[PDB]
Amino acid sequence: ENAARLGRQVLGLLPPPTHRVSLTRGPEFARGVRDLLSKYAASTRPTVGSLHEALRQAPFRQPTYGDFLVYSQTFSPQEPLGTFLFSFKQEDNGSSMDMLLTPTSLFMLSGMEAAKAPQTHKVAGVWYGSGSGLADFIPNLSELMDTGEFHTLLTPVGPMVQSVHSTFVTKVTSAMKGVGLARDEPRAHVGLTLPCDMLVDLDREPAGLNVTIYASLVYLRVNQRPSMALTFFQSGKGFAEVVAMIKDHFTDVIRTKYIQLRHELYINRLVFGAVCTLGTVPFDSHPVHQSLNSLPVLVFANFEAACGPWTVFL
């Protein structure tokens, strides 16, 4: 008998059902619009029962999706669903199509070593031949790594949601705010996926409802030619500690750069890195290790994405 008492507390605490107005039949459009207007008009009056109907509303929010339209020569068809996206907006007068830089694509524009990232160079050697078609569009991968203005051009967006890959032009949909769901009606939690090679995990420590994910884009020079580097971080330590933890990771890079630039050192050379904030992960959700043709790729559940400005650190 006591389960019948719980059948009332469930059916009295549910959200109200969303109204379904049929736009194909005639006399079923009249009966559906009328029950909007006869039911909203009793959610405005100042009596107690009309105030009772205004308290049941459950305002759950929805993410804001972006619609991007990419060349297929700069975006591989083999990309895991949930790959992060960087936009690039150097020039405006064309305004025809857009550049989207996955971290396995930006690994080729940098020219960073395959001993720092061992596994993701082989996968970036089969999805792209020699990094030419990625770099045919930027004539300044040598003058944006000197003057230090590459991080000023990237705006982080969010993970992949939907990609209708064609032969010439790839149409990519992302999720900028909120938890990344597939926009199509069987809504699945497409969480953000990163390779285990890029991500460097920092961690008695307390945990909140939050562990953020940061993006560091570090300038350096290999073979006495400019070549940046990009790593991902993950810690819930607050912004004052992580900047102290990133500089410990790059002690061997700051030393070996300014030795190479000991004699000539221009003022544009001094800028080193920049840290963005990509989004939060709730604690109690551990990432699941996953292999893809083999590439060790983390997958996060319920990664709700945010966006922060690039702040220079050194």
Partner: protein, 302 residues
């Protein structure tokens, strides 16, 4: 609904129930965002102990990790708290002991107990633990204590290394007292562990000598035209005696397209000093009632 129930695993007495009764409606940080919680997570003095030296940076550095919660109910077997979601409208009551007047459209931030530990520390001897409370303070004093606490750990290192360097009487009044409008307050910094307060100072010396290497020369030459000609109300630190180093950089001539590349690069290292003067979370108050001392703010951490 969101709430936190916290057990008191032994018992508690009638004196410390009246001590926890006066401290109702105060924000404390606690360890984990679980519904069930024990006594070991709620103290800010799990790191701030009595037999050991405190570390007011590391105590504050601990405070931007934790979740923050407001007390509602004090029971002899439990403490029921309500938590704070990272983007949430909520209410905070001005209980806190150095009374600073708030208003609507102010800017709060949570600080460690920096004027009286003995006021914030009430000890729970029935369980073998003490629960320690922070203080929420508008950011005009949130920053100004961290400006003052780092000046202490510069000059206390000089005086402890050699006492002939620093006169002690001028050391106590200047490095400990925090200047505020109307009142000057004495910090509770006498026996601390400065070993993480120097790593912050070892991060200034990277940003600061970069800022000394690329000073734009037009701003240097405007000082020499201002410290000895005009008497401006905020240059009066600099008397007619200009620093001699400023005049020794005047030997080169002005150049506009070589000071654009110095104004721009110096601009992006000023944006980096918001990683070294950080407070904890922020509480944007949008309404306040002075006869009830009840602010209604918006919580946003980091």
């Amino acid at each position: 609904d969101k709430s936190i129930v916290v057990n008191l695993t032994s018992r508690l007495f009638a004196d410390e129930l009246a001590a926890l009764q006066s401290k109702i409606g105060s924000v404390l940080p606690l360890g984990d965002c679980h519904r069930l919680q024990n006594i070991q997570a709620l103290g800010l003095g799990c790191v701030c102990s009595r037999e050991t030296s405190p570390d007011y940076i590391q105590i504050m550095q601990y405070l931007s990790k934790c979740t923050l919660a407001v007390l509602e109910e004090v029971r002899p077997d439990s403490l029921r708290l309500t938590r704070m979601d990272p983007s949430d409208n909520l209410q905070i009551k001005n209980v806190y002991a150095p009374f600073f007047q708030w208003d609507s459209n102010t800017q709060l931030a949570v600080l460690p107990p920096l004027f009286s530990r003995k006021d914030s520390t009430i000890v729970l001897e029935s369980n073998g633990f003490d629960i320690v409370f922070p203080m929420v303070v508008p950011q005009q004093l949130g920053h100004a204590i961290l400006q003052q606490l780092l000046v202490y750990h510069i000059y206390s290192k000089i005086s402890a290394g050699a006492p002939g360097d620093v006169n002690m009487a001028e050391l106590d009044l200047y490095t400990t007292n925090v200047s505020f409008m109307g009142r000057t307050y004495r910090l509770d910094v006498d026996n601390t562990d400065p070993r993480t307060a120097l790593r912050v100072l070892d991060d200034l010396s990277m940003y600061l000598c970069i800022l000394s290497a690329l000073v734009p020369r037009g701003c240097l030459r405007l000082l020499t035209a201002l410290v000895r000609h005009d008497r401006h109300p905020l240059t009066e630190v600099f008397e007619g005696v200009v620093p001699d180093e400023v005049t020794r950089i005047d030997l080169d001539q002005l150049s506009v397209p070589d000071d654009i590349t110095r104004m721009r690069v110096m601009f992006s290292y000023l944006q980096s000093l918001s990683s070294i003067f950080n407070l904890g979370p922020r509480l944007h108050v949008y309404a306040y009632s002075a006869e009830t001392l009840a602010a209604s703010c918006w919580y946003s951490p980091r």
